Design a protein around this ligand. Structure first.
Ligand SMILES: CCCCCCCCCCCCCCCCCC(=O)O
Ligand SMILES: CCCCCCCCCCCCCCCCCC(=O)O
Ligand SMILES: [Cl-]
Ligand SMILES: [Cl-]
Ligand SMILES: [Cl-]
Ligand SMILES: [Cl-]
Ligand SMILES: [K+]
Ligand SMILES: [K+]
Ligand SMILES: [K+]
Ligand SMILES: [K+]
Ligand SMILES: [K+]
Ligand SMILES: [K+]
Ligand SMILES: [K+]
Lengths: 243, 271, 48, 244, 243, 271, 48, 49, 48
């Protein structure tokens, strides 16, 4: 026999190990691979698909209503419409999105984010709103003047129903942790900032028209987005074995 | 019939420097979600960008990297020196939820078995004993007792190891009669029956059972067994909407209705 | 990252015995992100 | 025309030595495992003495006593070479030598009329054991030229299914179609040669699977006759005559 | 010694493993391979050989009689003669056939099937029968009209005593399970259909001839047939060790 | 003398598209089972078919794939620290029935031995002990006791292992004096004797015995042993009609007569 | 299925020590299915 | 270390095994082979007497 | 029988460590069976 010296690690079962092992059916010949549409090779292909943000997560909103950002005819100027931390993996409106679910399967992320909004009022309903991304350092902007100093887009309601605000990757490090859990890891260190929306002018409507309307909010990863360090999704759990 | 190409990349996209734009021609920001297409607005078109040669890889999100690790699929204790486990991945939710992210998938699997002896009070014992795990395909006779003739296993594959040896491990090929396993099936298990209990399950996903025993009788103790499965050489099709409700049953995707997924906050205007 | 050079010999008869695949690339996501018949260029309006 | 049109002619003539057999209602000819009898190769042989090859004196057709297809007929069988161990020079050569090797040409005969119906399975089974009894009787394992009646046809006397005996060289004598079956059999064994008085390489069985019936008043006495010819035989280990 | 790390699976005894091992008699030289007729290299060669189906498996039929399909002069038209599920591995008339035995040594099958029938009445006995294969979806056909809508052959009794009905492989998947066990696996999913036989005209005979006759039924695998996943044949069992 | 060729294939046959046929010439469906030949009617001749490039393999039904796995052939407990097992595969029916599917066969074998200590009540013990398995060919002296001189095993092959080590395993060549093993023998074991007990057994199939002992005396306990055999490099001749009745004896194929193989149904016209 | 490339070196003296054969093909079954002297073409009647 | 998987038979002592093993005296140099009549290489040479 | 090809590398310094010899042939037994000075042909009488 060839002299050998076995080392530490011998006999261990590392769940992420990658060895060759004897097959239970050495001569088995599988069915042929047939042509099936929709092959996916990497989940980055999935997170780049836009999905709805559960943005109106308040007590008064149940089910489907939670996807609608309320808009209404104002009687004052420069008012706020919504606010949200842009971090894709933290608990909140983003957690149930495609981007959020996969981000929650990982410990770190990087990349620009695509936040698209679609106005759903009547054809006659007009308006202009400003959507801004505030890079980290302080608290969310308190008014439109402060918000507009950051990255932003001014959206004019019209034939093209939607607008995109790209939250560009602006970070000190190449990656950020996906959680902002503070008590233990002090990961608040990684906060990516805020996205806020304000009336640029006002929502305006004709006589007897609905004075309230909705905006749907979509989010997806941009082409420079990636994830690292797989981890179990915190949303999937159980008590005893299922029967 | 494929009109949309799918070129492969090994790194994420670079950022190219861009300058200001004041025009009535190009309007990258204007979109129309009604079309069903995700926005095509690029970073460079929305703000002035710098050059970034981005070498970030994409490996850890590949199907192989995502699925390529072991997860618990079975855990039980023998009774009378034997246990019959129907091969299915619905008992333990973590791996189950992962698989349901795809509609169809082909993959080989590496099964790892960790076993030890425990007493009546479920206290682990330092006791080395030989155990046998036999794969019984559908149609083959399943042993009723620890000493039944089926354990001869002249055709059924069996793996015999010892609790004193490292975990047992064997690879299995893509065994379905179908051209891919299905993790979502909107149909029934048979013709002539429309009972709810026969809905949503594709029989071809069930390849049989694993029956386990100790080769000889333990005195008052039992064999505790954990079976782990690791998908390998994964090919997948049609990504699915992720599970967003707790699982309740091993064989069905039944769930409890809910009015929210994430927790509520005071107001939509306070992040 | 991954090694540019490393052992890659199969010891077993069936491919099912082989270690994990080592490609791990991603592909253009258009079939999922923009499965439309008419091309809608980034610089133009989507609908006219 | 038969080889041109791709069909098998219903007439046949089998000529070996000083014997000729004819039939006008055959159903082709079976050659067991697609192999005609062959001589022992120098590379397979082990016994070193020059063999005796009797030629025409033993390679000819021997007709055995006929058997009646009675109302309760379960079938009949003959062991080879046992059945011919005391017939002609084939029998003498078999007795005078320790070793024997050879093939066979079997012709089973059973004619009735276009007013009769019935079907016989004619099968040549290698190493066919008569093991339905705890202790098989010599009279049944080696019935001689008279052959022996089947007692357990459904289980083929060996614990297997009669219906699967078709895996062995066979033909059928279906009265509406043919009145004879012909099988050419090569020597089969796990050895180059063996003793003809201790081992029977083949067993010929004629089993009724569809009972004999006929228009009322037709001839009721219908015999079954077996004619067998040793083919390509050789013997080694000469000494005095010895029978089992 | 060369550094090594032993892995999970070490020491295990997988019955289907395939390793090289020391020989008890390293210098042993076996007897030569001699010329023996009938060499078989694959059991597909065996299942392609026709064997009798124990088709008349009813209380009144014992032993050899179970292989005979009863036929008789009718006094009504379009009557049924027999029926059978075509599945080669399930309990029933097929289980004791060559095809059935080997199919029962495996978990999955694929391929067309050859069902051949031989008429055994007198030379003067005539008749025409229709044999049909009904692909799955419903129950076995209730009458000849329903049966003839499927794959079928019309057989005319004559000089050529036999006819073949090929049950072509018509399946959703490339393979089918060999059992239709439902209570546990719900394999009824794989049912391959039915084969039924009906009088096309009638069995006709001269004066004083037997008014009943028999048909023998043979079955075999076609050249596109194969089996996968070996398993122990359920028919072979024992209580204690044999002495 | 072979007039029928046997070309080899690695996949099943393809299906070629066919069209209708209305003629008096070609009649593929007409057959004649009396000839002893299996029907030669092809799918394409019986119905209109489509093109099917069938890549289904044939590997799992090869003799090597069918026989190439371990099956139990012996199981016993020592008595007085020793046990004598006559090498024969008739005690355990699964492997026995498989072998009887062929008339003659040549093959090497891999024997695997799994042993453990059990007490008087047949309860397994966690006790490592050295054991010896000695192959005693016919004609060699078989030890009467656990400490007899034959255990010196200077010529007889022996394998010494421990219940604390993995199962012992050794390969054996094709050892018969014949040119193939016989799984059906219509003859007697000797000249001059026609007793039923000497019928149907070919002596050359018996290569000797395995005698087992613990190297030193166990205190009140016994050694439980299982011997598995795996045919390798199989060459086979003359397929046989499969066993269709239960086995009753270890050395003979005697059986209980039966009037049916499959269970009865109400009527031949109801599937 | 089976690997197109994989280790195939024998470590022992006797062939009996070698791992299982890796051919596994099948052959024309005619010697068992149609062991007849006269060819009976599929398109013609069997007997004339 | 190179990943390995030990198999059944490991640790066993087959009396007819044939492995290489460390020598107790690795540098030992035996006496020369001298010319001695009657060398036998196979016992078939003896049974033929 | 013996393999025509198989590993044959020595891992140790001293030949005593090597596995068994693999020749195993036999030689003309004349030195034992016919150790005589005068040749006595098979076809002739031994002594004259
Ligand atoms: C002899 C050693 C035993 C090792 C285990 C062998 C297991 C064989 C079964 C393989 C089937 C795995 C695929 C199952 C995928 C479907 C899951 C589900 O829908 O529940
Ligand atoms: C020293 C280690 C012991 C290992 C076991 C060695 C066994 C040697 C005997 C080999 C004979 C096997 C072939 C038997 C086939 C015949 C079976 C039967 O008809 O019952
Ligand atoms: Cl969080
Ligand atoms: Cl927070
Ligand atoms: Cl069944
Ligand atoms: Cl059923
Ligand atoms: K790049
Ligand atoms: K645009
Ligand atoms: K985008
Ligand atoms: K001559
Ligand atoms: K093909
Ligand atoms: K034809
Ligand atoms: K056929």
């Amino acid at each position: 026999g060839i002299p050998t010296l076995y080392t530490p690690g011998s006999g261990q079962f590392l769940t992420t190990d990658d060895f060759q092992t004897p097959c239970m059916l050495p001569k088995f010949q599988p069915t042929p691979v047939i042509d099936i549409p929709g092959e996916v090779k990497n989940f980055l292909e999935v997170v780049q698909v836009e999905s709805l943000v559960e943005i109106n997560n308040v007590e008064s909103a149940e089910g489907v209503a939670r996807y609608r950002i309320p808009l209404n005819v104002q009687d004052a100027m420069d008012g706020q419409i919504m606010a949200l931390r842009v971090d894709p993996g933290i608990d909140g409106p983003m957690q149930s999105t495609l981007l959020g679910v996969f981000t929650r399967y990982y410990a770190q992320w990087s990349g620009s984010l695509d936040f698209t909004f679609m106005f759903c009022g009547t054809f006659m309903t007009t308006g202009k709103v400003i959507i801004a991304y505030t890079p980290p350092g302080g608290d969310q902007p308190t008014n439109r003047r402060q918000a507009m100093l950051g990255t932003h887009v001014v959206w004019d309601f019209g034939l093209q129903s939607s607008i995109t605000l790209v939250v560009p990757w602006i970070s000190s490090g190449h990656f950020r942790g996906t959680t902002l859990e503070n008590t233990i890891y002090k990961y608040r260190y990684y906060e990516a900032g805020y996205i806020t929306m304000w009336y640029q002018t006002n929502m305006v409507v004709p006589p007897n028209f609905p004075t309230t309307a909705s905006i749907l909010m979509f989010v997806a990863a941009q082409p420079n987005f990636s994830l690292r360090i797989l981890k179990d999704r915190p949303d999937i759990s159980q008590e005893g074995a299922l029967q | 019939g494929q009109v949309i190409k799918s070129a492969v990349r090994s790194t994420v996209e670079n950022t190219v420097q861009s300058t200001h734009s004041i025009t009535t021609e190009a309007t990258p920001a204007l979109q129309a979600a009604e079309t069903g297409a995700t926005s095509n607005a690029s970073d460079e078109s929305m703000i002035e960008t710098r050059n970034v040669v981005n070498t970030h890889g994409v490996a850890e999100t590949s199907l192989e990297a995502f699925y390529g690790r072991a997860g618990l699929v079975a855990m039980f204790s023998t009774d009378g020196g034997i246990y019959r486990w129907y091969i299915n991945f619905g008992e333990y939710v973590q791996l189950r939820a992962k698989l349901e992210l795809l509609t169809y998938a082909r993959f080989d699997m590496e099964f790892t078995i960790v076993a030890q002896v425990v007493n009546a009070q479920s206290k682990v014992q330092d006791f080395n004993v030989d155990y046998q795990v036999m794969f019984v395909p559908p149609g083959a006779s399943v042993p009723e007792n620890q000493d039944s003739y089926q354990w001869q296993s002249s055709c059924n594959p069996s793996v015999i190891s010892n609790t004193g040896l490292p975990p047992a491990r064997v690879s299995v090929p893509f065994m379905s009669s179908a051209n891919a396993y299905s993790f979502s099936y909107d149909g029934y298990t048979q013709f002539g029956d429309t009972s709810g209990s026969s809905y949503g399950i594709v029989p071809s996903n069930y390849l049989g059972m694993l029956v386990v025993r100790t080769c000889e009788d333990l005195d008052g103790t039992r064999l505790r067994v954990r079976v782990y499965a690791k998908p390998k050489h994964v090919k997948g099709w049609i990504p699915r909407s992720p599970r967003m409700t707790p699982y309740k049953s091993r064989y069905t995707g039944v769930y409890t209705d809910t009015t929210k997924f994430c927790a509520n906050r005071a107001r939509i205007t306070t992040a | 990252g991954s090694n540019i050079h490393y052992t890659n010999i199969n010891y077993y008869e069936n491919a099912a015995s082989n270690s994990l695949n080592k490609q791990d690339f991603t592909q253009d996501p258009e079939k999922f992100t923009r499965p439309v018949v008419d091309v809608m260029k980034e610089a133009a309006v989507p609908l006219k | 025309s038969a080889e041109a049109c791709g069909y098998s002619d219903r007439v046949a003539q089998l000529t070996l030595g000083n014997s000729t057999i004819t039939t006008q209602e055959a159903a082709n000819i079976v050659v067991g495992y697609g192999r005609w009898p062959t001589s022992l190769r120098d590379t397979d042989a082990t016994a070193v003495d020059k063999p005796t090859q009797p030629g025409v004196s033993a390679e000819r057709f021997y007709t055995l006593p006929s058997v009646q297809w009675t109302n309760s007929f379960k079938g009949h069988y003959w062991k080879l070479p046992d059945a011919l161990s005391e017939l002609g020079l084939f029998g003498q050569n078999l007795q005078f030598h320790y070793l024997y090797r050879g093939g066979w040409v079997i012709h089973v005969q059973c004619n009735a009329t276009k007013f009769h119906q019935g079907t016989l399975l004619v099968v040549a089974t290698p190493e066919h054991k008569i093991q339905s009894a705890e202790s098989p009787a010599f009279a049944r394992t080696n019935p001689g030229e008279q052959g022996a009646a089947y007692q357990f046809p459904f289980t083929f006397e060996d614990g297997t299914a009669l219906g699967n005996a078709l895996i062995y060289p066979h033909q059928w004598v279906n009265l509406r179609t043919n009145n004879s079956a012909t099988l050419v059999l090569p020597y089969v064994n796990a050895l180059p040669m063996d003793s003809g008085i201790r081992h029977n390489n083949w067993t010929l069985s004629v089993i009724p699977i569809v009972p004999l019936e006929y228009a009322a008043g037709a001839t009721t006495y219908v015999p079954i006759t077996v004619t067998i010819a040793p083919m390509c035989t050789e013997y080694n280990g000469l000494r005095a005559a010895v029978t089992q």
